[PDB]
Amino acid sequence: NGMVGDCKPLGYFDPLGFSKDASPETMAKFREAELKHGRVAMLACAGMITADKFHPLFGGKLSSNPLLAITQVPKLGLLQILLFIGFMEVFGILNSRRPDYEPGNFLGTSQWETTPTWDAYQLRELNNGRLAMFGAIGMLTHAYITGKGPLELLD
Amino acid sequence: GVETELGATGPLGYWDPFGFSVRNPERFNRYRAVELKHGRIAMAATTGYMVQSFLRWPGYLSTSANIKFADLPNGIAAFKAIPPAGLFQILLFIGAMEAFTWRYYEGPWPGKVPEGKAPGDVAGDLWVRYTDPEEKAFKLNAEINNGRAAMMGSLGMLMHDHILGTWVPPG
Amino acid sequence: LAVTDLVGASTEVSNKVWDPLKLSENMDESNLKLVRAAELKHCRVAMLATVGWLWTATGTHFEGMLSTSSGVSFADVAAAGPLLGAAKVPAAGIWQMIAAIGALEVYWENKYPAAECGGDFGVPRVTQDPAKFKEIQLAELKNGRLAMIGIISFACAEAIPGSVPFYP
Amino acid sequence: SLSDLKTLATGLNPVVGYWDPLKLGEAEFWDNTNEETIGWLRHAEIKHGRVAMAGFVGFIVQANGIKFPWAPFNAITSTSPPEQWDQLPDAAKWQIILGVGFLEWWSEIRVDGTPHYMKGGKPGYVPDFDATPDQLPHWVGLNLYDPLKWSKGASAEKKQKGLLTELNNGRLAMLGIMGFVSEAKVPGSVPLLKGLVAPYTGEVMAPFATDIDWSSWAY
Amino acid sequence: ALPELSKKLNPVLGYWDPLNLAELNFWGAGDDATVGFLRHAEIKHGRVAMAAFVGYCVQSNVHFPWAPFNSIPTNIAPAEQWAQLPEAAKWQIILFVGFLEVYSEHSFILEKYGQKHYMKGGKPGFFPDFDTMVHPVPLNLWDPLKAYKGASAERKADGLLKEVNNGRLAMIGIMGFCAEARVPGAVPALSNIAHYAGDPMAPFAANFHLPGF
Ligand code: CLA
Ligand SMILES: CCCCCC(=O)OC\C(C=C=C1C(C)(C)C[C@H](OC(C)=O)C[C@@]1(C)O)=C/C=C/C(C)=C/C=C/C=C(C)/C=C/C=C(\C)C(=O)C[C@@]12O[C@]1(C)C[C@@H](O)CC2(C)C
Ligand SMILES: CC(=O)O[C@H]1CC(C)(C)C(=C=C/C(C)=C/C=C/C(C)=C/C=C/C=C(C)/C=C/C=C(\C)C(=O)C[C@@]23O[C@]2(C)C[C@@H](O)CC3(C)C)[C@](C)(O)C1
Ligand SMILES: CC(=O)O[C@H]1CC(C)(C)C(=C=C/C(C)=C/C=C/C(C)=C/C=C/C=C(C)/C=C/C=C(\C)C(=O)C[C@@]23O[C@]2(C)C[C@@H](O)CC3(C)C)[C@](C)(O)C1
Ligand code: KC2
Ligand code: KC2
Ligand code: KC2
Ligand code: KC2
Numbered sequence: 001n002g003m004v005g006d007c008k009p010l011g012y013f014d015p016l017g018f019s020k021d022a023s024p025e026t027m028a029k030f031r032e033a034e035l036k037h038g039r040v041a042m043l044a045c046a047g048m049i050t051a052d053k054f055h056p057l058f059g060g061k062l063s064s065n066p067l068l069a070i071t072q073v074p075k076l077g078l079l080q081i082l083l084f085i086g087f088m089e090v091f092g093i094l095n096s097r098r099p100d101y102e103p104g105n106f107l108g109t110s111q112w113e114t115t116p117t118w119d120a121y122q123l124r125e126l127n128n129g130r131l132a133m134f135g136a137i138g139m140l141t142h143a144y145i146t147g148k149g150p151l152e153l154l155d
Numbered sequence: 156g157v158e159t160e161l162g163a164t165g166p167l168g169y170w171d172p173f174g175f176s177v178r179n180p181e182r183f184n185r186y187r188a189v190e191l192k193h194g195r196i197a198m199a200a201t202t203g204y205m206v207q208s209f210l211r212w213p214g215y216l217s218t219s220a221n222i223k224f225a226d227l228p229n230g231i232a233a234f235k236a237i238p239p240a241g242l243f244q245i246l247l248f249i250g251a252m253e254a255f256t257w258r259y260y261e262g263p264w265p266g267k268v269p270e271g272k273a274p275g276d277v278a279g280d281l282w283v284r285y286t287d288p289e290e291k292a293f294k295l296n297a298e299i300n301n302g303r304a305a306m307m308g309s310l311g312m313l314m315h316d317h318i319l320g321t322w323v324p325p326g
Numbered sequence: 327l328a329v330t331d332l333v334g335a336s337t338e339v340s341n342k343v344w345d346p347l348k349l350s351e352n353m354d355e356s357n358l359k360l361v362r363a364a365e366l367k368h369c370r371v372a373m374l375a376t377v378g379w380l381w382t383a384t385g386t387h388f389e390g391m392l393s394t395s396s397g398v399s400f401a402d403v404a405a406a407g408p409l410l411g412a413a414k415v416p417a418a419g420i421w422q423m424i425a426a427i428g429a430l431e432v433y434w435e436n437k438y439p440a441a442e443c444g445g446d447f448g449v450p451r452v453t454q455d456p457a458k459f460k461e462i463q464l465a466e467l468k469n470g471r472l473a474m475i476g477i478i479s480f481a482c483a484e485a486i487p488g489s490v491p492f493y494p
Numbered sequence: 495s496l497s498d499l500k501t502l503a504t505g506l507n508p509v510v511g512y513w514d515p516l517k518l519g520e521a522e523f524w525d526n527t528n529e530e531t532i533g534w535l536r537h538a539e540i541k542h543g544r545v546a547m548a549g550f551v552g553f554i555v556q557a558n559g560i561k562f563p564w565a566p567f568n569a570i571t572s573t574s575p576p577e578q579w580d581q582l583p584d585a586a587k588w589q590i591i592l593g594v595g596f597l598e599w600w601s602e603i604r605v606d607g608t609p610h611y612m613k614g615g616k617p618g619y620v621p622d623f624d625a626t627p628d629q630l631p632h633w634v635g636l637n638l639y640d641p642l643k644w645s646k647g648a649s650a651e652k653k654q655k656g657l658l659t660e661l662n663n664g665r666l667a668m669l670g671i672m673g674f675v676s677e678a679k680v681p682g683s684v685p686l687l688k689g690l691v692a693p694y695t696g697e698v699m700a701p702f703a704t705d706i707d708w709s710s711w712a713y
Numbered sequence: 714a715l716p717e718l719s720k721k722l723n724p725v726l727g728y729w730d731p732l733n734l735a736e737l738n739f740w741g742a743g744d745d746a747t748v749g750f751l752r753h754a755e756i757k758h759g760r761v762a763m764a765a766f767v768g769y770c771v772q773s774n775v776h777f778p779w780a781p782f783n784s785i786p787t788n789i790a791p792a793e794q795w796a797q798l799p800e801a802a803k804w805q806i807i808l809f810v811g812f813l814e815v816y817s818e819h820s821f822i823l824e825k826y827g828q829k830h831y832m833k834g835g836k837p838g839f840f841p842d843f844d845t846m847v848h849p850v851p852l853n854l855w856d857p858l859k860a861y862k863g864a865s866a867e868r869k870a871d872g873l874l875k876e877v878n879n880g881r882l883a884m885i886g887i888m889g890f891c892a893e894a895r896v897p898g899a900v901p902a903l904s905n906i907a908h909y910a911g912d913p914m915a916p917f918a919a920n921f922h923l924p925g926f
């Protein structure tokens with residue numbers, strides 16, 4: 001309770017009742033994990049969709065297959081991506097350590113006068129994150145099975 | 156009396172050119188039962204024609220006679236081509252529903268509508284019952300009106316298929 | 327709602343709520359109604375799917391062209407089979423079907439929400455006696471449970487050879 | 495109860511006491527208490543004994559040449575009963591297995607108002623169809639146990655003696671039927687039946703067509 | 714009722730229901746309904762078997778000398794004669810017996826005559842007169858000429874007992890005839906007449922084969 005993840009098609013969806021008889025610490029951990037998965041999956045789905053048919057970097061001929069492309073990427077690029085993500089994650093940890101801390105709010109929304117519009121847009125973020133969570137796993141599975149990218153699989 | 160009953164709607168409102176219920180309002184319930192009966196049979200007939208146009212059942216109609224469902228035409232020729240045993244079973248089923256399952260009339264020879272019932276309330280307990288009075292009246296009016304349009308249409312299809320052999324007239 | 331309150335406790339399991347894994351022990355009223363709505367939607371879709379599979383497998387199909395542009399006939403789709411016929415259907419037709427079903431589901435979710443109304447979209451009622459209506463609800467759930475099992479059995483029987491022996 | 499089991503051990507054999515060297519009587523299964531575990535073990539014993547008692551007579555009546563003179567059975571000419579099962583149609587095989595499955599289903603559902611055997615119920619009890627006519631799919635009519643009602647009205651002492659006889663004869667019929675199939679598969683395993691059960695080179699614990707015997711370890 | 718009736722039929726044996734069929738609750742209709750249905754079934758079978766015995770004995774030696782019966786031989790099995798009969802005649806005979814049966818089953822009619830259905834206090838085998846029928850009905854099934862309509866009450870039950878025993882005997886007799894007919898030597902000392910090879914429980918085997926078989 002106190003969150004904004006509930007929606008119309010499923011209501012307050014918790015069949016197995018993880019949040020039931022759970023601490024606010026565990027609830028905040030769950031919502032942080034949910035939003036992180038949603039955001040990373042948005043990035044993944046958009047990356048596969050765009051890089052399938054438009055990949056000018058790295059000579060313009062790296063494989064459109066998502067699973068082959070990351071192996072083709074040089075080691076330094078992977079190291080830099082890991083460094084960037086870790087540098088975001090240390091700030092995530094510090095935001096968790098802060099006294100005021102909503103789970104996924106790096107923006108510090110609590111200091112401003114927010115309303116149901118802000119709640120609805122947080123719900124939009126969360127719903128798109130759920131859809132992208134399913135989408136990214138689907139795309140990777142199809143890439144492993146067929147060896148084609150998303151848009152080439154659709155072709 | 157009769158001017159405000161289910162059916163006194165539409166462009167005509169109450170419509171008695173040859174004054175049937177005006178002369179004999181007591182017979183209005185019998186007439187309503189007959190109208191519902193003919194309307195329902197015609198809805199079934201019109202849907203049967205329209206759906207036999209494009210969809211036909213699979214398998215043989217009668218394996219002994221080597222008559223297949225697709226071999227039959229769409230019209231009176233199909234009922235002609237059904238084997239005699241099929242026609243007898245059809246009559247038996249229709250008679251069973253007419254006499255026992257859905258009894259439109261109570262008794263004697265000149266059958267009256269059942270006492271504790273509507274003119275054409277033939278279904279048993281397991282049937283859709285509307286409890287909203289407005290919706291009940293509206294949908295009973297829809298029933299009788301669709302029945303009327305269906306019998307006009309079904310007479311049209313029957314005459315067209317008698318003249319030509321196809322219920323669809325050219326045009 | 328306690329799970330014992332909902333209709334579905336079958337005679338085939340001694341008139342007790344059947345939860346081997348205790349999935350609904352930690353479930354709320356809204357969540358339980360949502361899960362029942364999902365159960366009933368699956369039941370109804372599986373019933374219709376079983377009838378459609380029987381029709382197309384026995385060869386029932388319309389007389390015409392499903393698409394003049396692609397030259398795909400109802401006979402062409404049906405002759406391939408219940409499973410490969412779906413692949414042979416034009417993609418645009420599949421999208422029309424999905425769009426219509428989605429429009430109806432959006433409208434019925436807005437008018438009759440799953441959480442507030444558990445698989446009760448407000449269609450007319452065949453009986454008003456509570457005992458009879460509970461019996462019809464139980465009959466619906468049983469028929470649709472068997473329909474889910476049947477349609478999945480048909481799919482695996484046709485996909486993998488000889489999975490189901492009595493698959494007609 | 496374990497004490498009740500010890501009491502029944504005297505009834506089944508006064509000399510042989512509660513002979514349970516593996517101590518499965520004291521075990522607890524599926525997080526259930528010892529009473530429920532004993533209910534399961536007793537029902538398993540009685541059901542095995544029942545099937546073995548109906549299987550010994552079947553093996554004799556089939557190997558001796560008596561056979562149903564109708565189509566699917568008169569199509570089976572072989573005499574070795576395992577070979578007869580292997581030669582049955584798969585439809586007949588499944589229609590036996592699932593028929594017995596329905597009977598097991600009915601044996602498990604308790605709607606007549608008695609506990610299930612792992613909940614204080616009587617082990618080895620099949621509910622009667624006639625007890626609850628509303629709870630049945632159409633109308634079965636004749637009960638699986640005592641269909642023609644010859645044992646109706648028997649005294650509880652006679653019924654309990656019948657239970658003791660059931661368990662003992664069941665225990666012995668286990669070894670009887672498994673001795674038959676032992677001779678059928680591994681010759682020279684039950685000495686007295688030498689030359690009375692034909693050899694069988696398939697697999698008596700595979701109802702449908704397979705060719706994976708215990709060939710790696712045999713004889 | 715069955716114990717006292719059985720002792721009346723044969724007091725030495727008394728009661729022999731070895732399979733406890735009276736005890737079995739037929740269609741969950743109650744033991745009283747089981748008794749009524751079983752008694753009516755025994756009487757129906759006995760009447761039809763008695764008639765079938767006489768008819769078999771007659772048909773093995775005599776036929777009607779007008780068509781279509783004159784064309785049938787008598788030196789064949791009577792079951793073979795039935796098999797040869799035209800399909801329409803078979804259906805019409807079966808439909809007539811169906812009329813007699815459904816008239817016997819009609820509750821309103823035998824209630825008019827003062828009886829109930831055989832499994833609810835209806836005395837087994839009270840067939841009704843065709844008075845509720847619409848157009849003229851010159852004669853009836855039982856007492857067609859009204860000869861013994863004013864019979865004696867004790868005679869009216871002695872006749873029931875004799876009917877039951879004679880029906881039992883005719884059941885075994887007609888079935889012995891069918892046994893020797895379809896299986897030569899089935900009934901020893903009977904193997905003298907007719908050895909047709911076909912199922913007598915196939916009314917229209919000669920006409921059509923039902924699908925699925
Ligand atoms: C792993 C990501 C993840 C996480 C951590 C959460 C967390 C949360 N969700 Mg959930 N949610 C997710 C994904 C996730 N969600 C997805 C993808 C959907 C779309 C179906 C939803 C839909 C959804 C709704 C509609 C609602 C929530 C709500 C909630 C919150 C309360 C319920 C709870 O205790 O959940 C705890 C969740 C977990 C402990 C995660 C367990 C994951 C298991 C182990 C995996 C199951 C999936 C299976 C293995 C594979 C699926 C198929 C395929 C991908 C292979 C909580 C913050 C409710 C809320 O916010 O109310 C205010 C709410 O209303 N979620
Ligand atoms: C299980 C048994 C069910 C039986 C009843 C049934 O299924 O009811 C179903 C039902 C309603 C319902 C219910 C449900 C809610 C669905 C189910 C519930 O059921 C239960 C049991 O609870 C309750 C119930 C029955 O209320 C509705 C049925 C509706 C139906 C069948 C309606 C036909 C109109 C046709 C017309 C107007 C034709 C005009 C025809 C015309 C004007 C023409 O002929 C014109 C034309 O052709 C011509 C002449 C030549 C052509 O060239 C051109 C055209 C084409 C222009
Ligand atoms: C043992 C083995 O190995 O194999 C076996 C088992 C195995 C595998 C399971 C097999 C299977 C499949 C099986 C048994 C499948 C069973 C399927 C099943 C039980 C299918 C029900 C459908 C119900 C329908 C279509 C209802 C529609 C209802 C309609 C059209 C309505 O709209 C009704 C309604 O309009 C009314 C009248 C008015 C209102 O009141 C309400 C509404 C509007 C809703 C095998 C292979 O066959 C045989
Ligand atoms: C071979 C061996 O070793 O053994 C056996 C084997 C086997 C096969 C069993 C054999 C046989 C067959 C047998 C013995 C068959 C027996 C058949 C039998 C017993 C057939 C009864 C018919 C009765 C009728 C038609 C009654 C009409 C009665 C009518 C029309 C009435 O008027 C009724 C009546 O009530 C009124 C209304 C008025 C009252 O005043 C009294 C009367 C009665 C007048 C064998 C070959 O023979 C020997
Ligand atoms: C996570 C996001 C991200 C950020 C925020 C970020 C920031 C910066 C900044 C500071 C603003 C500098 C100054 C810088 C410089 C270089 N980046 Mg870099 N970078 C990111 C991602 C990647 C990836 C994926 C790759 C990459 C590369 C290079 C090369 C090329 C070297 C070469 O010519 O070989 C050079 C010089 C590529 C590489 O290392 O290729 C072997 C490569 O694949 N970067 N990058
Ligand atoms: C829920 C199912 C469903 C509904 C309710 C529905 C309703 C309507 C309506 C009214 C609202 C119109 C006006 C309309 C019109 C067209 N439909 Mg459509 N349709 C459904 C299903 C399919 C399928 C399966 C196919 C299909 C098609 C076409 C074509 C093109 C034909 C062609 O180009 O040859 C046209 C013009 C075919 C197609 O596009 O094939 C490439 C095709 O296969 N439809 N359809
Ligand atoms: C093929 C299988 C089979 C065989 C070969 C077999 C042999 C013997 C023998 C051996 C000579 C005896 C002496 C015996 C005796 C009793 N059997 Mg038994 N029986 C078989 C099957 C079943 C089933 C299914 C049931 C059953 C029962 C009883 C009862 C009831 C007691 C009571 O009602 O208290 C008694 C007295 C019913 C029950 O309740 O058993 C607890 C029951 O359901 N039996 N049974
Ligand atoms: C194939 C036809 C047929 C045969 C071969 C046959 C032979 C015998 C014989 C054996 C030689 C005797 C001695 C005998 C005697 C009685 N028969 Mg009988 N009977 C046949 C047919 C019917 C029918 C349709 C009815 C009937 C009846 C009576 C009654 C009345 C009792 C009463 O009303 O008190 C008595 C006494 C009526 C009834 O209800 O009997 C239950 C009745 O309706 N029978 N019946």
Ligand SMILES: CC1=C(C#C/C(C)=C/C=C/C(C)=C/C=C/C=C(C)/C=C/C=C(C)/C=C/[C@@]23O[C@]2(C)C[C@@H](O)CC3(C)C)C(C)(C)C[C@H](O)C1
Binds near residue numbers: 307
């Ligand atoms: C053409 C021709 C020939 C011919 C011919 C002949 C004689 C043809 C005759 C054709 C004829 C007689 C055609 C009638 C149609 C009537 C219709 C469609 C009415 C529908 C009416 C309906 C559906 C009414 C519905 C309503 O009641 C509802 C349901 C509720 C009310 O609220 C509202 C109303 C009242 C509206 C020859 C001689 C054979 C050869 C020659 O060479 C060519």
